[PDB]
């Protein structure tokens, strides 16, 4: 029958149990326990305190989708794909799929995706009771998990964009929504003359200070607790917005950009570190995953190249330059947009 | 980099937004509206009352995963795979993925899959407030949706198993949990001498009677409202359990089989219509989808061939024969197990 291939393709794409099986495996640390020697259902059930027959039924789907394989009778081992759920694999995919950590927990928001397409508004609060960052504020453990996930690739998060900008004429940097201070730290290492300030939320500021202290950068990078919708705590030659604006709908993104514009020294620049696909190039799974997460988590959005041109104008800014960043690790197209006063 | 293929494979398998995007498209009847002439985002937003920019973002992922394609600038059409979401396509995949119909609604149970692997118990009640069939009992609209989904393929559901059994020495049939009476009806057509009784729950009995009335079979197939954990309403030469036992854990399945055994005429047989994969043949997506749905919806289970041998023994029965059924439509391996008193 001619449509069976198409049918199977649709059913697979539409299957909700398959990603939940992957995330359940991640959460139970199943692959770690297997690598440590528990290859049978009875051994793995003991290690995870799960019911043996129910665990077998989970394992059966993990084999069907190619994450595990039955090596000997009743003995299971990870495939090349399944091995990526080992806890210390550099892609950190176990943590990214762990239902007790911030992102896979937030992904439950997708169960109300129709509401988000109707309203353009996030569904996270309807599930967890508070909007995303307020929820993280009330759950320091989730805050910590979130901060660690985002920084899982330091070359992409911090080193590549720091290396792609000329800091020679920069004296002061303000990193707005700067997380644990990784970006500010990478700049400081490359540009010894720079002093930097990280503006962040409660909880994150302590992680940031502790990180910078560990790095021996406390004297060059300070951390300020604050709200980037209010006047910024000081002026700067370079103001960093690294994966900040995508958290926000257009009217909020403009407010943040305007606060940054108002804090620029003469000759200063605003640096945006984000995706910037041309619209015609944006129909890809990397763009849509992050963009749709921003919708249901936060009501934010990824902006295509043509939108960035528009957003800058509204904040009294102009796009001076868009620097296509190298991909030092995985092929993941990122840019550094450089904005100047209009 | 050598692991990028494996990484992409894992990320796709683990993606929760992708099936929710498919189910959102199904629920919004997007493909139907496109086929009817709404090919632009602005036309489709009007037809679905969704926010245009949010709908574009949904459509972008539908293109990325190959369900839609951009035909002309800003105009979208279904692919060969996407066309299967048309409402009248025989595979009924739009309805099976519609979040307001019974099954895709029940699939939200998978968001608590770790609890089900730990306990072996369903998560449906924890989401919807009542166990599965009690919830359907309180929502006649969902009951109706459920009954219609299961019967979407009448050749597989009713005609094939009816044609695969010799009714010559059968005078009375009892179809236990017989749904709308489709199986009983198919037997009645093939075996004019048979009288049949459908035992079902409230609500379903009215649909059954109405269906049989429409079929002109009221005089040969009657419908009884009842509970198959209680003594069965009469004796029979053939007792049908078509996709019933998988709804139930082993101890409940044995109780049902025992009630059936207690209602058999001399020489009678119990006919089980279900999957019966050998365990070594069960590591496939058809088996696991249904098996894992039974776990989280109901705490039920698919039984492999070797389990059926064991279950029959416990009910005072013996497997006389397992008839591998033909697949008149899609390749979906089903059997008719014939059980006799031990
Ligand atoms: N109103 C607000 N004021 C200051 N920071 C805020 C804020 N709302 C959200 N944030 C911060 O915005 C950050 C976005 S995550 C970005 C982290 C970092 N710039 C990186 O590239 O890795 C979060 O750390 C969050 O704490
Ligand atoms: N306690 C009970 N007594 C009688 N029927 C029950 C029951 N619990 C569940 N059922 C029925 O069991 C059926 C399982 S669905 C099976 C439908 C049909 N035999 C077919 O093959 O298509 C449902 O229709 C449900 O109403
Ligand atoms: O083709 N498949 O892989 C497939 C999977 C699950 C199903 O329920 C059906 Cl009907 C088919
Ligand atoms: O999947 N990710 O999120 C991810 C990000 C960066 C990486 O270097 C790798 Cl290897 C993986
Ligand atoms: O889940 N993510 O990939 C993700 C990335 C960046 C974010 O700011 C948030 Cl809030 C989530
Ligand atoms: O999509 N993300 O959220 C994400 C997060 C961290 C990364 O290094 C990369 Cl490359 C991507
Ligand atoms: O994809 N993101 O949203 C994201 C956020 C923070 C980061 O450091 C990186 Cl590298 C990526
Ligand atoms: O050329 N350098 O001095 C230099 C310094 C830091 C970097 O990350 C890179 Cl990539 C280069
Ligand atoms: O390789 N991919 O397809 C892919 C998709 C989403 C991601 O966040 C990343 Cl990091 C990679
Ligand atoms: O996917 N299904 O559930 C399904 C079942 C029976 C069919 O004939 C077809 Cl075509 C599809
Ligand atoms: O979702 N399903 O495929 C499905 C099939 C049969 C059932 O009895 C139930 Cl309860 C669900
Ligand atoms: O898996 N199911 O639930 C299911 C339902 C109806 C069918 O015709 C088939 Cl073939 C399969
Ligand atoms: O797969 N099932 O569970 C199922 C249930 C009822 C049916 O009529 C058919 Cl054909 C299949
Ligand atoms: O040979 N017959 O008489 C007959 C009757 C009904 C059927 O469904 C089939 Cl398949 C065959």
Nearest to B85 by CA among B27, B39, B141: B27
CA distance B106 to chain A (A): 11
Nearest to A129 by CA among A146, A105, A150: A105
Cα separation, B154 vs B182, whole angstroms? 8
- For the record, the structure tokens of A268 come out as 């200063």
Cα separation, A4 vs A11, whole angstroms? 10
Backbone angles phi, psi at B72, to 5 degrees: -110, 170
- Could you tell me the fold of the domain covering A1-99? Arc Repressor Mutant, subunit A (1.10.10)
Ligand 4 centre and the CA of A92: distance in Å? 7
Domain ranges in chain A with CATH number 1.10.10.10: 1-99
Under 8 Å between Cβ of A159 and A186:
yes
A98 part of contact set with chain B, CB < 8 Å = no
Cα separation, A170 vs A189, whole angstroms? 14
- For the record, the structure tokens of A240 come out as 């960093």
For A47, other C-beta atoms within 10 Å of its C-beta total 18
Cα separation, B316 vs B307, whole angstroms? 15
Under 8 Å between Cβ of B338 and B271:
yes
Q: What is the CA radius of gyration of chain B?
A: 22
CA distance B130 to chain A (A): 19
In this complex, which of B1, B3, B22 lies closest to A13 when CB atoms are compared?
Answer: B22
Q: Name the method of structure determination.
A: X-ray
* Annotation: binding site of B: 143, 153, 177, 200, 227-228, 242, 247, 293
CA B50 to chain centre: 31
Ligand 2 centre and the CA of B240: distance in Å? 11
- For the record, the structure tokens of A49 come out as 């305190």
**Model resolution, angstroms:** 1.8
Ligand 4 in contact with A83 (CB < 6 A)?
Answer: no
- Identify any residues that bridge with A317 across adjacent strands, giving them in sequence order: A341
Q: What separation, in Å, do the N-terminal and C-terminal C-alpha atoms of chain A show?
A: 62
Strand order in A221-225's β-sheet?
A221-225, A195-200, A172-176, A236-242, A264-274, A335-341, A317-324
For B231, other C-beta atoms within 10 Å of its C-beta total 11
Q: What is the CA radius of gyration of chain A?
A: 22
Under 8 Å between Cβ of B64 and A285:
yes
Under 8 Å between Cβ of B173 and B233:
no
B324 part of contact set with chain A, CB < 8 Å = no
In the three-class reduction of DSSP (H, G, I as helix; E, B as strand; rest coil), residue B9 is classed as helix
Helix B4-14 to helix A285-298 angle, to the nearest 10 degrees? 40
Cα separation, B27 vs B100, whole angstroms? 7
Nearest to B93 by CA among B255, B264, B330: B330
Cα separation, B41 vs B47, whole angstroms? 10
Cα separation, B5 vs A111, whole angstroms? 28
Cα separation, B224 vs A201, whole angstroms? 64
Q: Work out whether strand B68-70 and strand B76-78 pair parallel, antiparallel, or are unpaired.
A: antiparallel
Ligand 14 centre and the CA of A226: distance in Å? 77
What is the three-state SS of chain A? CCCHHHHHHHHHHHCCHHHHHHHHHHHCCHHHHHHCCCCEHHHHHHHHCCCHHHHHHHHHHHHHCCCEEECCCCEEEECCCHHHHCCCCCCCHHHHCCCCCHHHHHHHHHHHHHHHHHHCCCCHHHHHCCCHHHHHHHCHHHHHHHHHHHCCCHHHHHHHHHHCCCCCCCCEEEEECCCCCHHHHHHHHHCCCCEEEEEECCCHHHHHHHHHHHCCCCCCEEEEECCCCCCCCCCEEEEEEECCHHHCCHHHHHHHHHHHHHCEEEEEEEEEEECCCCHHHCCCHHHHHHHHHHHHHHCCCCCCHHHHHHHHHHCCEEEEEEEECCCCCCCCCCEEEEEEEC
**Secondary structure (DSSP) of B72-138:** STTBEEE-TTGGGGSTT-TT-HHHHT-TTSHHHHHGGGGGGHHHHHHHS---HHHHHSS-HHHHHHH
- For the record, the structure tokens of A143 come out as 């805050």
Nearest to A26 by CA among A110, A83, A109, A106: A83
Q: Do A16 and B291 touch (CB under 8 A)?
A: no
Helix A204-214 to helix A140-150 angle, to the nearest 10 degrees? 50
In the three-class reduction of DSSP (H, G, I as helix; E, B as strand; rest coil), residue B264 is classed as strand
Domain ranges in chain B with CATH number 3.40.50.150: 151-275+300-342
Cα separation, A240 vs B95, whole angstroms? 48
Cα separation, B73 vs A280, whole angstroms? 9
In this complex, which of A1, A54, A301 lies closest to B330 when CB atoms are compared?
Answer: A1
Q: For the domain A100-150+276-299, what is the CATH code?
A: 1.10.287.1350
Cα separation, A304 vs A295, whole angstroms? 15
Nearest to A328 by CA among A103, A136, A146, A156: A156
Strands (DSSP E) along chain B, which ranges?
Answer: 68-70, 76-78, 172-176, 195-200, 221-225, 236-242, 264-274, 317-324, 335-341
In chain B, count H helices and then E strands: 18, 9
Cα separation, B337 vs A86, whole angstroms? 42
Q: Work out whether strand A221-225 and strand B221-225 pair parallel, antiparallel, or are unpaired.
A: unpaired
Q: What does the angle CA A127 – CA A132 – CA A133 come to, to the nearest 5 degrees?
A: 150
- Identify any residues that bridge with A318 across adjacent strands, giving them in sequence order: A340
Place of tokens 């003995």: A75
Distance set, CA B285 to CA A9, B105, B142, B332 (Å): 12, 20, 26, 11
Distance set, CA B105 to CA A17, B97, B113, B329 (Å): 13, 9, 15, 26
Nearest to A15 by CA among B58, B84, B17, B117: B17
Check: CATH 3.40.50.150 for B151-275+300-342? yes
DSSP state of B325: P
Q: Whose alpha carbon is nearest atom 26 of ligand 1?
A: A201
Ligand 12 in contact with B309 (CB < 6 A)?
Answer: no
Place of tokens 């909007």: A131
Cα separation, B202 vs B204, whole angstroms? 5
Nearest to A27 by CA among A98, A102, A104: A98
Under 8 Å between Cβ of B188 and B240:
no
Ligand 14 centre and the CA of B167: distance in Å? 12
Which contacts qualify for B223-229: CB closer than 8 Å, 24 or more apart? B223/B181, B223/B197, B223/B198, B224/B197, B224/B198, B224/B199, B224/B200, B225/B200, B225/B201, B226/B199, B226/B200, B227/B201, B228/B176, B228/B177, B228/B199, B228/B256, B228/B259, B229/B255, B229/B256, B229/B259
- Identify any residues that bridge with B238 across adjacent strands, giving them in sequence order: B173, B269
- Identify any residues that bridge with A173 across adjacent strands, giving them in sequence order: A196, A238
In this complex, which of B53, B84, B293 lies closest to A6 when CB atoms are compared?
Answer: B84
């Amino acid at each position: 029958p001619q449509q069976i291939d198409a049918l199977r393709t649709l059913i697979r794409l539409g299957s909700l149990h398959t990603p939940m099986v992957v995330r359940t495996a991640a959460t139970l640390r199943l692959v770690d326990h297997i690598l440590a020697g528990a290859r049978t259902v009875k051994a793995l059930a003991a290690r995870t305190d799960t019911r043996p027959e129910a665990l077998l039924r989970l394992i059966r789907h993990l084999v069907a989708i190619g994450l595990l394989e039955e090596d000997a009778p009743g003995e299971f081992v990870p495939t090349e794909v399944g091995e990526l759920l080992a806890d210390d694999h550099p892609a950190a995919q176990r943590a990214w799929h762990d239902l007790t950590q911030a992102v896979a927990r937030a992904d439950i928001s997708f169960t109300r995706l129709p509401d988000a397409i109707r309203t353009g508004r996030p569904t996270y609060e309807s599930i967890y009771g508070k909007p995303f960052y307020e929820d993280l504020a009330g759950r320091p453990d989730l805050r910590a998990s979130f901060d660690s996930l985002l920084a899982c690739d330091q070359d992409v998060a911090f080193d590549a964009p720091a290396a792609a900008y000329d800091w020679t004429n920069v004296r002061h940097v303000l990193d707005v929504g700067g997380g644990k201070g990784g970006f500010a730290a990478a700049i400081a290492r490359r540009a010894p003359h720079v002093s930097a300030t990280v503006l962040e939320m409660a909880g994150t500021v302590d992680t940031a200070r502790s990180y910078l202290k560990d790095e021996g950068l406390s004297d060059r990078v300070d951390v300020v607790e604050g709200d980037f919708f209010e006047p910024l705590p000081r002026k700067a030659d370079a103001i960093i917005l690294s994966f900040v604006l995508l958290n926000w709908p257009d009217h909020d993104a403009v407010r943040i950009l305007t606060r940054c514009a108002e804090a620029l020294e003469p000759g200063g620049r605003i640096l945006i570190h984000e995706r910037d696909d041309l619209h015609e190039n944006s129909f890809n799974e990397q763009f849509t995953e992050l963009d749709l997460r921003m919708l249901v988590f936060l009501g934010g959005a990824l902006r295509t190249r043509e939108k960035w041109d528009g957003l800058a104008a509204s904040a009294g800014l102009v796009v001076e330059e868009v620097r296509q960043l190298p991909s030092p690790t995985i092929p993941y197209d990122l840019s550094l947009l450089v904005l100047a006063p209009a």
